[PDB]
Design a protein around this motif. Structure first.
Motif, PDB file in Angstrom:
ATOM      1  N   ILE A   1      64.352   5.720 -27.840  1.00  0.00           N
ATOM      2  CA  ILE A   1      63.221   5.459 -26.953  1.00  0.00           C
ATOM      3  C   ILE A   1      62.475   6.753 -26.652  1.00  0.00           C
ATOM      4  O   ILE A   1      61.241   6.797 -26.691  1.00  0.00           O
ATOM      5  CB  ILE A   1      63.707   4.767 -25.666  1.00  0.00           C
ATOM      6  CG1 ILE A   1      64.211   3.356 -25.977  1.00  0.00           C
ATOM      7  CG2 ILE A   1      62.599   4.704 -24.624  1.00  0.00           C
ATOM      8  CD1 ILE A   1      65.251   2.853 -24.986  1.00  0.00           C
TER       9      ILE A   1
ATOM     10  N   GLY B   1      63.374   2.510 -13.291  1.00  0.00           N
ATOM     11  CA  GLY B   1      63.102   2.786 -11.893  1.00  0.00           C
ATOM     12  C   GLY B   1      62.863   1.548 -11.056  1.00  0.00           C
ATOM     13  O   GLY B   1      62.807   1.651  -9.825  1.00  0.00           O
TER      14      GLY B   1
ATOM     15  N   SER C   1      59.815   6.699 -10.586  1.00  0.00           N
ATOM     16  CA  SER C   1      60.454   6.556 -11.887  1.00  0.00           C
ATOM     17  C   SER C   1      60.604   7.934 -12.513  1.00  0.00           C
ATOM     18  O   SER C   1      59.631   8.692 -12.596  1.00  0.00           O
ATOM     19  CB  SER C   1      59.637   5.634 -12.801  1.00  0.00           C
ATOM     20  OG  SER C   1      59.943   5.852 -14.165  1.00  0.00           O
ATOM     21  N   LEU C   2      61.826   8.262 -12.936  1.00  0.00           N
ATOM     22  CA  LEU C   2      62.038   9.522 -13.640  1.00  0.00           C
ATOM     23  C   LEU C   2      61.267   9.543 -14.951  1.00  0.00           C
ATOM     24  O   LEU C   2      60.728  10.583 -15.351  1.00  0.00           O
ATOM     25  CB  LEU C   2      63.524   9.739 -13.909  1.00  0.00           C
ATOM     26  CG  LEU C   2      64.406  10.094 -12.713  1.00  0.00           C
ATOM     27  CD1 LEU C   2      65.851   9.762 -13.032  1.00  0.00           C
ATOM     28  CD2 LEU C   2      64.257  11.555 -12.333  1.00  0.00           C
ATOM     29  N   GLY C   3      61.202   8.399 -15.634  1.00  0.00           N
ATOM     30  CA  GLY C   3      60.586   8.369 -16.948  1.00  0.00           C
ATOM     31  C   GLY C   3      59.084   8.543 -16.890  1.00  0.00           C
ATOM     32  O   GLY C   3      58.506   9.280 -17.691  1.00  0.00           O
ATOM     33  N   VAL C   4      58.429   7.868 -15.944  1.00  0.00           N
ATOM     34  CA  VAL C   4      56.987   8.038 -15.784  1.00  0.00           C
ATOM     35  C   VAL C   4      56.664   9.491 -15.452  1.00  0.00           C
ATOM     36  O   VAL C   4      55.754  10.095 -16.034  1.00  0.00           O
ATOM     37  CB  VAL C   4      56.449   7.079 -14.707  1.00  0.00           C
ATOM     38  CG1 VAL C   4      55.017   7.421 -14.364  1.00  0.00           C
ATOM     39  CG2 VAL C   4      56.559   5.639 -15.186  1.00  0.00           C
TER      40      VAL C   4
ATOM     41  N   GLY D   1      54.758   3.225 -16.900  1.00  0.00           N
ATOM     42  CA  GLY D   1      55.138   2.379 -15.787  1.00  0.00           C
ATOM     43  C   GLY D   1      56.641   2.294 -15.687  1.00  0.00           C
ATOM     44  O   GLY D   1      57.351   2.355 -16.696  1.00  0.00           O
ATOM     45  N   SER D   2      57.128   2.149 -14.460  1.00  0.00           N
ATOM     46  CA  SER D   2      58.565   2.144 -14.224  1.00  0.00           C
ATOM     47  C   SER D   2      59.232   0.992 -14.965  1.00  0.00           C
ATOM     48  O   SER D   2      58.744  -0.142 -14.959  1.00  0.00           O
ATOM     49  CB  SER D   2      58.850   2.033 -12.726  1.00  0.00           C
ATOM     50  OG  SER D   2      60.240   1.960 -12.470  1.00  0.00           O
TER      51      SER D   2
ATOM     52  N   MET E   1      64.202   8.084 -20.753  1.00  0.00           N
ATOM     53  CA  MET E   1      63.445   9.300 -21.027  1.00  0.00           C
ATOM     54  C   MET E   1      64.232  10.557 -20.673  1.00  0.00           C
ATOM     55  O   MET E   1      63.946  11.627 -21.223  1.00  0.00           O
ATOM     56  CB  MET E   1      62.130   9.290 -20.249  1.00  0.00           C
ATOM     57  CG  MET E   1      61.115   8.224 -20.681  1.00  0.00           C
ATOM     58  SD  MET E   1      60.913   8.086 -22.467  1.00  0.00           S
ATOM     59  CE  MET E   1      59.800   9.450 -22.765  1.00  0.00           C
TER      60      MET E   1
ATOM     61  N   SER F   1      67.277   6.514 -16.499  1.00  0.00           N
ATOM     62  CA  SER F   1      66.087   6.503 -17.340  1.00  0.00           C
ATOM     63  C   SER F   1      66.408   6.899 -18.775  1.00  0.00           C
ATOM     64  O   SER F   1      67.131   7.868 -19.023  1.00  0.00           O
ATOM     65  CB  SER F   1      65.050   7.472 -16.762  1.00  0.00           C
ATOM     66  OG  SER F   1      63.910   7.558 -17.597  1.00  0.00           O
TER      67      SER F   1
HETATM   68  O1  LIG Z   1      63.339   1.318 -22.344  1.00  0.00           O
HETATM   69  C1  LIG Z   1      62.489   2.110 -21.980  1.00  0.00           C
HETATM   70  N1  LIG Z   1      61.331   2.275 -22.712  1.00  0.00           N
HETATM   71  C2  LIG Z   1      60.308   3.141 -22.396  1.00  0.00           C
HETATM   72  O2  LIG Z   1      59.331   3.198 -23.118  1.00  0.00           O
HETATM   73  N2  LIG Z   1      60.445   3.886 -21.281  1.00  0.00           N
HETATM   74  C3  LIG Z   1      59.348   4.806 -20.941  1.00  0.00           C
HETATM   75  C4  LIG Z   1      57.996   4.083 -20.769  1.00  0.00           C
HETATM   76  C5  LIG Z   1      57.771   3.995 -19.247  1.00  0.00           C
HETATM   77  O3  LIG Z   1      56.449   4.419 -18.911  1.00  0.00           O
HETATM   78  C6  LIG Z   1      58.790   4.986 -18.634  1.00  0.00           C
HETATM   79  C7  LIG Z   1      59.653   4.265 -17.592  1.00  0.00           C
HETATM   80  O4  LIG Z   1      60.695   5.159 -17.217  1.00  0.00           O
HETATM   81  P1  LIG Z   1      61.932   4.617 -16.355  1.00  0.00           P
HETATM   82  O5  LIG Z   1      62.708   3.628 -17.145  1.00  0.00           O
HETATM   83  O6  LIG Z   1      62.865   5.885 -16.022  1.00  0.00           O
HETATM   84  O7  LIG Z   1      61.406   3.969 -14.986  1.00  0.00           O
HETATM   85  O8  LIG Z   1      59.628   5.479 -19.706  1.00  0.00           O
HETATM   86  C8  LIG Z   1      61.571   3.788 -20.496  1.00  0.00           C
HETATM   87  C9  LIG Z   1      62.581   2.938 -20.800  1.00  0.00           C
HETATM   88  C10 LIG Z   1      63.810   2.844 -19.923  1.00  0.00           C
HETATM   89  O9  LIG Z   1      63.963   4.032 -19.150  1.00  0.00           O
END
Ligand SMILES: O=c1[nH]c(=O)n([C@H]2C[C@H](O)[C@@H](COP(=O)(O)O)O2)cc1CO
Ligand SMILES: O=c1[nH]c(=O)n([C@H]2C[C@H](O)[C@@H](COP(=O)(O)O)O2)cc1CO
Lengths: 143, 143
Positions: free
Chosen positions: B58, B13, B80-83, B9-10, A111, A109
């Motif tokens: 990002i 992930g 998803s770690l980011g969400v 949103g993922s 983030m 990720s």
């Molecule tokens: O390129 C990216 N751009 C971005 O805005 N994000 C943010 C917005 C999404 O809601 C969240 C998704 O996290 P992830 O990629 O770990 O599944 O993180 C995440 C990524 C890649 O992790």
């Protein structure tokens, strides 16, 4: 006491693929502090929460997070809860180490990778066999 | 002016739910500006091959948008770690938060998300794919 409080994070309902690695990480963390969240490495724990309500899980965890001197997260398995924990931990200005395994074939990720900032939030790539040596290095330099 | 809306949103992930993210983002435009509309791009993959310059960009841009956001909406079905990280930082900002989870996925939602709900500023709603617009309508009649 005098022991640093160590707060370990790892996927549970996001998947338990890395449970044995969580065990190795928790076992080594015990060398350098008291692990508040040893339950995350338990072999019985499943990914459908089959072993109190989620509200209790959340409240107890946040209590432990605020006690923590260092947050250690294995971030290879995508997990909402691990991400959530790290988000709250950043807001608490906790010292954070994240451990990622590129051999998984995943791209971590952005983030979490992008959150790396100074010595308080570090993200370390590793191969499974060096996890203990890396935890030693980390805690020998910044206990 | 128009409410600033922050959608989660993922991406890395997994993009299994991308079509639902597009429906959510499209409907959210009825109530305000979607700051994170790029999350719904159909061409977006899960490996970060679309952007150059590193993940630090990002993370920083996202946190800037999060601090601007009047409402946070997260589809939390795909781990998803980011969400999760976004929701943790958002909870620390005391943002108004709605998460939407699909039990038909066969998954059990993270206890850290489910348990973070206080029924007011942090709400977690189960839904089926067909009604996502109706639920967004129901939430934003009040928000
Ligand atoms: O390129 C990216 N751009 C971005 O805005 N994000 C943010 C917005 C999404 O809601 C969240 C998704 O996290 P992830 O990629 O770990 O599944 O993180 C995440 C990524 C890649 O992790
Ligand atoms: O039963 C639980 N107990 C618990 O402590 N957690 C916390 C600790 C883990 O580091 C993190 C895992 O979140 P998740 O289950 O969404 O993968 O959340 C998570 C669960 C289930 O989500």
């Amino acid at each position: 006491m005098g022991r640093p409080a160590l707060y370990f994070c790892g996927s549970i309902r996001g998947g338990r693929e890395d449970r044995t690695l969580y065990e190795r990480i928790v076992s080594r963390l015990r060398r350098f502090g008291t692990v508040l969240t040893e339950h995350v490495a338990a072999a019985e724990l499943g990914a459908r929460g089959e072993e109190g309500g989620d509200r209790l899980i959340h409240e107890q965890d946040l209590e432990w997070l605020q006690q923590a001197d260092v947050v250690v997260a294995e971030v290879t398995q995508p997990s909402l809860g691990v991400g959530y924990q790290l988000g709250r931990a950043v807001a608490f200005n906790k010292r954070i180490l994240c451990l990622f395994r590129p051999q998984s074939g995943r791209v971590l990720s952005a983030m979490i990778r992008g959150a790396a900032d100074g010595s308080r939030f570090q993200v370390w790539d590793y191969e499974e066999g060096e996890v203990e040596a890396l935890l030693d290095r980390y805690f020998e330099a910044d206990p």
